[PDB]
């Protein structure tokens, strides 16, 4: 009983006029938010998720602001008007726990800032994926057992097997095998390990691509990595 839910979540700061900071490294703050919304609406689910070994079947992007404005050599940027982030899952109990957790509370605390839940926008999922160009919303992490660049070719077989491992976890059983990624742009960004912002075209089985679109490409999805969108 999987299907994709994808949300855009807009937050406004406590006073509509002022500049709110966003730390450049805010994965961990965002992750507290999401895990606290779910733990609040559904503690049994959040204990299942805390235990489960493997992908958790959900991801979310970086926290972004309307306009931006970047100081020099400061740990944060400045944002204005609205703060927002996307979240995606193929587990309907996780999507419900997250939105209700944000409803059961609408006053949100991120890093040093006070925000109020403004809107949740639900997003239509593309009919098909074979052939589209994708842009990462949060960066993709690949590690092998170190960091695996997209310019190395293990990058791709590691991604491919993980999407097959998610496909076995969340569409029944034995996974499609046609897969290809054509990276158009790669830029690294490092956090504690390196992750990659990618523009990329992807080819091959639609249900295996849909997997990656719903739950993230690569690793640490549940820590906010590998969320993609169809390029505009």
Swiss-Prot record:
<dbReference type="InterPro" id="IPR045747">
    <property type="entry name" value="CRISPR-assoc_prot_Cas6_N_sf"/>
</dbReference>
<comment type="function">
    <text>CRISPR (clustered regularly interspaced short palindromic repeat), is an adaptive immune system that provides protection against mobile genetic elements (viruses, transposable elements and conjugative plasmids). CRISPR clusters contain sequences complementary to antecedent mobile elements and target invading nucleic acids. CRISPR clusters are transcribed and processed into CRISPR RNA (crRNA), also called psiRNA (prokaryotic silencing) in this organism. This protein processes pre-crRNA into individual crRNA units, with an 8-nt 5'-repeat DNA tag that may help other proteins recognize the crRNA.</text>
</comment>
<comment type="similarity">
    <text>Belongs to the CRISPR-associated protein Cas6/Cse3/CasE family.</text>
</comment>
<dbReference type="GO" id="GO:0004519">
    <property type="term" value="F:endonuclease activity"/>
</dbReference>
<dbReference type="GO" id="GO:0051607">
    <property type="term" value="P:defense response to virus"/>
</dbReference>
<dbReference type="Pfam" id="PF01881">
    <property type="entry name" value="Cas_Cas6_C"/>
</dbReference>
<dbReference type="InterPro" id="IPR049435">
    <property type="entry name" value="Cas_Cas6_C"/>
</dbReference>
<keyword id="KW-0255">Endonuclease</keyword>
<dbReference type="InterPro" id="IPR010156">
    <property type="entry name" value="CRISPR-assoc_prot_Cas6"/>
</dbReference>
<keyword id="KW-0694">RNA-binding</keyword>
<dbReference type="GO" id="GO:0003723">
    <property type="term" value="F:RNA binding"/>
</dbReference>
<keyword id="KW-0051">Antiviral defense</keyword>
<feature type="site" description="Transition state stabilizer">
    <location>
        <position position="56"/>
    </location>
</feature>
<keyword id="KW-0378">Hydrolase</keyword>
<comment type="subunit">
    <text>Monomer, binds precursor but not mature crRNA; is not part of the Cmr effector complex.</text>
</comment>
<feature type="active site" description="Proton acceptor">
    <location>
        <position position="35"/>
    </location>
</feature>
<protein>
    <recommendedName>
        <fullName>CRISPR-associated endoribonuclease Cas6</fullName>
        <ecNumber>3.1.-.-</ecNumber>
    </recommendedName>
</protein>
<feature type="active site" description="Proton donor">
    <location>
        <position position="50"/>
    </location>
</feature>
<dbReference type="GO" id="GO:0043571">
    <property type="term" value="P:maintenance of CRISPR repeat elements"/>
</dbReference>
<dbReference type="Pfam" id="PF21350">
    <property type="entry name" value="Cas6_I-A"/>
</dbReference>
<keyword id="KW-0540">Nuclease</keyword>
């Amino acid at each position: 009983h999987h299907h994709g839910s994808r949300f855009l979540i807009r937050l406004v700061p406590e006073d509509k006029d002022r500049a709110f900071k966003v730390p450049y490294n805010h994965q961990y703050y965002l992750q507290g938010l999401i895990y606290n919304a779910i733990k609040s609406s559904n503690p049994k689910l959040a204990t299942y998720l805390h235990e489960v070994k493997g992908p958790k079947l959900f991801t979310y992007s970086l926290f972004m602001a309307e306009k931006r404005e970047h100081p020099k050599g400061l740990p944060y940027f400045l944002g204005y008007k609205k703060g927002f982030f996307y979240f995606s899952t193929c587990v309907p109990e996780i999507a419900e726990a997250l939105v209700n957790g944000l409803l059961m509370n609408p006053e949100v605390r991120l890093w040093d800032e006070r925000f109020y839940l403004h809107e949740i926008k639900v997003l239509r999922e593309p009919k098909k994926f074979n052939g589209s160009t994708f842009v990462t919303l949060s960066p993709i992490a690949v590690t092998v057992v170190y960091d695996v660049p997209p310019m190395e070719k293990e990058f791709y077989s590691i991604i491919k097997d993980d999407l097959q491992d998610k496909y076995v976890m969340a569409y029944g059983d034995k996974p499609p095998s046609e897969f290809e990624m054509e990276v158009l742009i790669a830029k690294p960004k490092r956090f504690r390990q390196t992750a990659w912002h990618l523009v990329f075209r992807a080819y091959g089985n639609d249900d295996l691509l849909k997997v990656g679109y719903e739950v993230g490409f690569g690793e640490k999805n549940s820590l906010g990595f590998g969320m993609v969108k169809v390029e505009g």
